[PDB]
């Protein structure tokens, strides 16, 4: 007849979403010149298997880690890290070295003059991000990434999929308008945008900012995003997702300065930045971790992740198309499943061996 028994599959070919409750996973970048470790310049062990299609329909207990432009996924945008070297010249304020890389976009306050949505909750222990300019800026060419704690965190997601905040700093140009009149603009300016990473890669890029007020950069610190979930659960920081986002486009290396001239008998400040240098990157996860790329749909009312014709990858490079989302996944642990046999469960073949021996006689 038919006999159904519970079976344990220790290494099932299933996958499960990496969640915000997981501790950070390893993302390996192939260029240690511009990106901190861990480093691996090797191609995927099975390059021929990258991009294989799959339909995904899974559940989850904690909000999955997804990147891209979709509900439940963290949208990407360009982040700028600026190194400033003061200059003794009376007509120059600073010399600049800027890096533009695709990272996690903070939410914006549409009512509050298009600033960043900010949260002061659960401030982590760590070195605060610097507020002054180090006079002795040695090793200017070599970028040093140092983790620091911002004055306030930026909100990356504050909806029914969860609340994610990032206590890493976000750098922007602004004006010291505390003591000035109402004519001082209070809006922050991003020196670079998304198009600076994709279009006309080999062509010269220039950015010019002009104002009657000095240009200040803040918040300072060569520090990369460390997002964490604070609601409906509290999870650990994830300083590795930016590594995945930064490889999806070239990073752009700028130099420049801020100069001072006279206009209408008043000080006039101009920030000039140039770049003809872009660096392509490759960021990879390794087994048991993988990435599911495509139209990831996260439904939190039933805690379901679905995708039709997604692709399984392990590496992200500059040819990534941000019409797709990325879901971090890991090989599923052992599972329990009923299985149907045509005979009762047997511990050993001893009865079978005895029957064969008797039949031989």
């Amino acid at each position: 007849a038919n006999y159904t028994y519970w079976a344990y599959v220790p290494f099932p070919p299933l996958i499960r979403a990496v969640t915000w409750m997981d501790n950070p996973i390893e993302v390996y970048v192939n260029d240690s010149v511009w990106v901190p470790g861990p480093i691996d310049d090797r191609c995927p062990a099975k390059p021929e298997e990258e991009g294989m299609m799959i339909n995904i329909s899974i559940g989850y207990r904690y909000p999955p880690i997804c990147l891209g432009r979709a509900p439940g996924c963290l949208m990407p945008a360009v982040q700028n890290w600026l190194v400033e070297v003061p200059t003794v010249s009376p007509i120059s304020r600073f010399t600049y070295h800027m890096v533009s890389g695709m990272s996690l976009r903070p939410r914006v306050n549409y009512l509050q003059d298009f600033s960043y949505q900010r949260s002061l909750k659960f401030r982590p222990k760590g070195k605060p991000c610097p507020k002054e300019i180090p006079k002795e800026s040695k090793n200017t060419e070599v970028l040093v990434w140092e983790e620091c704690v911002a004055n306030s965190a930026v909100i990356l997601q504050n909806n029914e999929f969860g609340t994610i905040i990032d206590w890493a700093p976000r750098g922007q140009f602004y004006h010291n308008c505390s003591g000035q009149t109402q004519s001082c603009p209070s809006a922050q300016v991003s020196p670079a945008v998304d198009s600076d990473l994709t279009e006309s890669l080999d062509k010269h890029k220039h950015k010019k900012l002009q104002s009657f007020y000095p240009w200040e950069w803040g918040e300072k610190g060569i520090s990369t995003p460390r997002p964490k979930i604070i609601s409906p659960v509290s999870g650990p920081e994830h300083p590795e997702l930016w590594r995945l986002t930064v490889a999806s486009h070239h990073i752009r290396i700028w130099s420049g300065n801020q100069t001072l001239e006279t206009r209408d008998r008043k000080p006039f400040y101009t920030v000039d930045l140039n770049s003809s240098l872009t660096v392509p990157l490759q960021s990879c996860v390794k087994p048991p971790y993988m990435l599911v790329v495509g139209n990831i749909v996260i439904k939190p009312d039933s805690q379901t992740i679905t995708c039709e014709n997604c692709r399984l990858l392990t590496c992200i490079d500059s040819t990534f198309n941000w019409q797709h989302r990325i879901l971090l996944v890991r090989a599923r642990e052992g599972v329990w499943i009923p299985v149907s046999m045509d005979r009762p469960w047997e511990a050993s073949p001893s009865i079978h061996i005895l029957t064969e021996v008797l039949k031989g006689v």
Partner: protein, 153 residues
């Protein structure tokens, strides 16, 4: 916990993608042992074929929390597996002598467990493990039943 699957004949991506097709029917309903075995064989082969932990990647790990938690789950699973009673004819995975009770565990709980859920409608793994451990004593299963002995005799 970290490996470079270069020498193997099937990476993790290929195993997952090629298994998903049969995984659909596995999610739909109870399948035979041959179906499940064919569905899991490449995954089991891949996870029984890694040579050693890749030092180039391992020695760069700064935060060991995720690695240690993954290792703890693996060690717990190995400990539980070492005491499971399994049918002799299947060595890739362990078929226990616990009979599937459809009335107690309707298929939706199993499908939700396969999907990786842990809500109140999912199969209760701890309770099932308790039942299996209680019912899989060597003194209840190792000796073949009277019917088999009579058939031999």
């Amino acid at each position: 916990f970290i490996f470079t699957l270069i020498a193997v004949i099937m990476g993790l991506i290929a195993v997952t993608a090629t298994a998903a097709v049969a995984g659909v029917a596995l999610h739909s309903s109870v399948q035979s042992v041959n179906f499940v075995n064919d569905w899991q064989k490449n995954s089991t082969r891949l996870w029984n074929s890694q040579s050693s932990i890749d030092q180039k990647l391992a020695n760069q790990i700064n935060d060991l929390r995720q690695t240690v938690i993954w290792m703890g789950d693996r060690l717990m699973s190995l400990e539980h597996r070492f005491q499971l009673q399994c049918d002799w004819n299947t060595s890739d995975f362990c078929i226990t002598p616990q009979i599937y009770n459809e009335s107690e565990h309707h298929w939706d709980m199993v499908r939700r467990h396969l999907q990786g859920r842990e809500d109140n409608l999912t199969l209760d793994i701890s309770k099932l493990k308790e039942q299996i451990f209680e019912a899989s004593k060597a003194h209840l299963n190792l000796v073949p039943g009277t019917e088999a002995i009579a058939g031999v005799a």
